[PDB]
């Protein structure tokens, strides 16, 4: 009946169009609220959820949503609701983000960040109701991506109803501070130095969860987290001390649940920098290092060796490519091949800054400094400060330069053609400088079309593409650790990173 997280921090609000924290996500769009289009648990593909199906039309810039039938909103001291989800609903939860003629466009601030974030204000053309159980939006573009993104849980769908009441009682802050949602769980309590109490919503559309009662134990520290595990004052807790993960390893009392995280850290080649414009240098720098090594020494059980640019938890990933080896005789011969036999000078950006795809980038430089001096290669590692860093790279001042990605959406479009296309070069966030042709007839198509099989194939080819070509030296994905109780049935690993109660029970 009841469940207890240790959760990392406290909520900074109840409505998830204004942050874009996992930790605010994890108390308000997951437990409370749904989506017209889900992710699929466990994985990155997209399911219907208040939408029960969708259409695109043929020039794939009108999207129809044809909403489910039924569905009941939960209720508090002041509201209880006299209708069911409909389609003004919907129109209201987009228009408010994008409309500043809306009147709840400035209230609490108006900060949408992540809408803002996706390109959504360029993107829609407009967002309509058709009729009370339909809408529609028009898009500038064909856009495939689109669908991922409201799975996102900015896109969380809000009641009109409730908040033309409380613009009504004088008091529309309280749309966004006393929640009203659609979601498996209702809000029952909260207390920010303390804890947030939860209960299973009866008139829940979907199968209620098993669980009758969540509470939430406000925990910032966590050995703290670890320590009240053991004591079974909570049954599920995020971010271990990475000093701890080889104890709960050992722990009998917990399964350590681990999954590739949803990121990547490489290291770009600037192709438009000689010697680096020629592929065989660039092949011959990649089997010059000896990434086992670095894997173990970097990142110690927290990250795993990368042969493509996306996770292996995405869908698109190709497991037939085979990646470079660690080969310094065949890096000689390539060297040779390319006319520099004898090598030459280069620099080496290491990142001023810890990420989990990339937790020590100075090690790491010289590692890489010490294997390519065997070929030939004399590195000189730079740094600056984070936004100089930033700055310079984007600016392409660099010759080579170590950087990465975090998903937004767990679209394959969203690590390609972000980091990797013409476009992104023009930007200067394709550190590499890579436009080819081959590559863009490859992302262009499958970010517009809408068959998910032939989007599959296009991507699959995009990461044979960018093994032949070697732009950048991908190192690696992060390992995320999960630590729950045995007694607790069902619980899954989210490749998108929040943590999820509603399918688990407690033995």
Same mark, same amino acid.
């Given at each position: 009946?009841?469940?207890?997280?240790?959760?990392?921090?406290?909520?900074?609000?109840?409505?998830?169009?204004?942050?874009?924290?996992?930790?605010?996500?994890?108390?308000?769009?997951?437990?409370?609220?749904?989506?017209?289009?889900?992710?699929? !648990?466990?994985?990155?593909?997209?399911?219907?959820? $208040?939408?029960?199906?969708?259409?695109?039309?043929?020039?794939?810039?009108?999207?129809?949503?044809?909403?489910?039938?039924?569905?009941?909103?939960?209720?508090?001291?002041?509201?209880?609701?006299?209708?069911?989800?409909?389609?003004?609903?919907?129109?209201? *939860?987009?228009?408010?983000?994008?409309?500043?003629?809306?009147?709840?466009?400035?209230?609490?601030?108006?900060?949408?960040?992540? #809408?803002?974030?996706?390109?959504?204000?360029?993107?829609?053309?407009?967002?309509?109701?058709?009729?009370?159980?339909?809408?529609?939006?028009?898009?500038?573009?064909?856009?495939?991506?689109?669908?991922?993104?409201?799975?996102?849980?900015?896109?969380?769908?809000?009641?009109?109803?409730?908040?033309?009441?409380?613009?009504?009682?004088?008091?529309?802050?309280?749309?966004?501070?006393?929640?009203?949602?659609?979601?498996?769980?209702?809000?029952?309590?909260? +207390?920010?130095? *303390?804890?947030?109490?939860?209960?299973?919503?009866?008139?829940?559309?979907?199968?209620?969860?098993?669980?009758?009662?969540?509470?939430? *134990? !406000?925990?910032?520290?966590?050995?703290?987290?670890?320590?009240?595990?053991?004591?079974?004052?909570?049954?599920?807790?995020?971010?271990?001390?990475?000093?701890?993960?080889?104890?709960?390893?050992?722990? @009998?009392?917990?399964?350590?649940?681990?999954?590739?995280?949803?990121?990547?850290?490489?290291?770009?080649?600037?192709?438009? @920098?000689?010697?680096?414009?020629?592929?065989?240098?660039?092949?011959?720098?990649?089997?010059?290092?000896?990434?086992?090594?670095?894997?173990?020494?970097?990142?110690?059980?927290?990250?795993?060796?990368?042969?493509? $640019?996306?996770?292996?938890?995405?869908?698109?990933?190709?497991?037939?490519?085979?990646?470079?080896?660690?080969?310094?005789?065949?890096?000689?011969?390539?060297? @040779?091949?390319?006319? $520099?036999?004898?090598?030459? *000078?280069?620099?080496?950006?290491?990142?001023?800054?810890?990420?989990?795809?990339?937790?020590?980038?100075?090690?790491?430089?010289?590692?890489?400094?010490?294997?390519?001096?065997?070929?030939?290669?004399?590195?000189?590692?730079?740094?600056?400060?984070?936004?100089?860093?930033?700055?310079?790279?984007?600016?392409?001042?660099?010759?080579?330069?170590?950087?990465?990605?975090?998903?937004?959406?767990?679209?394959?479009?969203?690590?390609?053609?972000?980091?990797?296309?013409?476009?992104?070069?023009?930007?200067?966030?394709?550190?590499?400088?890579?436009?080819?042709?081959?590559?863009?007839?490859?992302?262009?198509?499958?970010?517009?079309?809408?068959?998910?099989?032939?989007?599959?194939?296009?991507?699959? +080819?995009?990461?044979?593409?960018?093994?032949?070509?070697?732009?950048?030296?991908? !190192?690696?994905?992060?390992?995320? #650790?999960?630590?729950?109780?045995?007694?607790? @049935?069902?619980?899954?690993?989210?490749?998108?990173?929040?943590?999820?109660?509603?399918?688990?029970?407690?033995?």
């Amino acid at each position: 009946k009841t469940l207890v997280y240790c959760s990392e921090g406290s909520p900074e609000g109840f409505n998830p169009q204004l942050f874009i924290s996992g930790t605010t996500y994890d108390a308000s769009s997951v437990p409370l609220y749904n989506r017209l289009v889900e992710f699929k !648990i466990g994985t990155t593909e997209v399911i219907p959820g $208040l939408a029960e199906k969708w259409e695109v039309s043929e020039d794939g810039k009108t999207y129809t949503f044809h909403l489910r039938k039924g569905v009941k909103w939960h209720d508090n001291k002041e509201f209880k609701p006299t209708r069911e989800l409909n389609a003004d609903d919907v129109v209201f *939860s987009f228009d408010r983000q994008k409309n500043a003629q809306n009147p709840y466009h400035k209230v609490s601030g108006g900060s949408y960040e992540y #809408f803002e974030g996706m390109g959504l204000p360029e993107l829609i053309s407009e967002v309509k109701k058709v009729d009370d159980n339909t809408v529609q939006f028009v898009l500038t573009r064909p856009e495939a991506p689109f669908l991922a993104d409201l799975a996102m849980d900015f896109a969380s769908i809000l009641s009109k109803e409730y908040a033309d009441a409380m613009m009504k009682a004088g008091t529309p802050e309280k749309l966004d501070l006393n929640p009203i949602g659609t979601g498996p769980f209702q809000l029952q309590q909260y +207390q920010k130095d *303390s804890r947030i109490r939860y209960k299973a919503f009866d008139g829940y559309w979907g199968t209620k969860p098993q669980i009758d009662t969540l509470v939430f *134990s !406000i925990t910032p520290d966590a050995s703290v987290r670890y320590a009240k595990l053991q004591k079974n004052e909570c049954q599920v807790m995020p971010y271990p001390n990475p000093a701890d993960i080889a104890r709960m390893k050992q722990d @009998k009392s917990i399964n350590l649940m681990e999954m590739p995280g949803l990121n990547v850290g490489y290291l770009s080649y600037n192709v438009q @920098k000689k010697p680096l414009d020629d592929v065989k240098v660039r092949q011959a720098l990649t089997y010059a290092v000896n990434k086992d090594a670095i894997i173990k020494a970097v990142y110690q059980g927290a990250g795993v060796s990368a042969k493509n $640019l996306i996770p292996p938890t995405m869908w698109g990933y190709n497991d037939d490519v085979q990646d470079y080896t660690y080969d310094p005789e065949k890096a000689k011969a390539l060297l @040779k091949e390319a006319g $520099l036999e004898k090598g030459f *000078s280069i620099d080496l950006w290491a990142m001023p800054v810890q990420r989990p795809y990339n937790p020590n980038a100075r090690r790491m430089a010289e590692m890489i400094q010490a294997d390519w001096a065997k070929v030939g290669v004399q590195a000189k590692i730079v740094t600056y400060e984070w936004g100089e860093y930033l700055k310079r790279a984007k600016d392409g001042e660099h010759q080579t330069v170590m950087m990465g990605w975090t998903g937004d959406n767990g679209d394959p479009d969203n690590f390609f053609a972000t980091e990797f296309s013409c476009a992104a070069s023009e930007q200067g966030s394709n550190y590499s400088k890579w436009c080819y042709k081959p590559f863009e007839d490859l992302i262009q198509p499958a970010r517009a079309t809408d068959d998910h099989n032939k989007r599959v194939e296009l991507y699959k +080819q995009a990461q044979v593409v960018m093994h032949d070509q070697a732009p950048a030296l991908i !190192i690696a994905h992060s390992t995320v #650790f999960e630590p729950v109780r045995k007694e607790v @049935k069902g619980y899954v690993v989210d490749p998108l990173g929040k943590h999820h109660f509603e399918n688990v029970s407690i033995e």
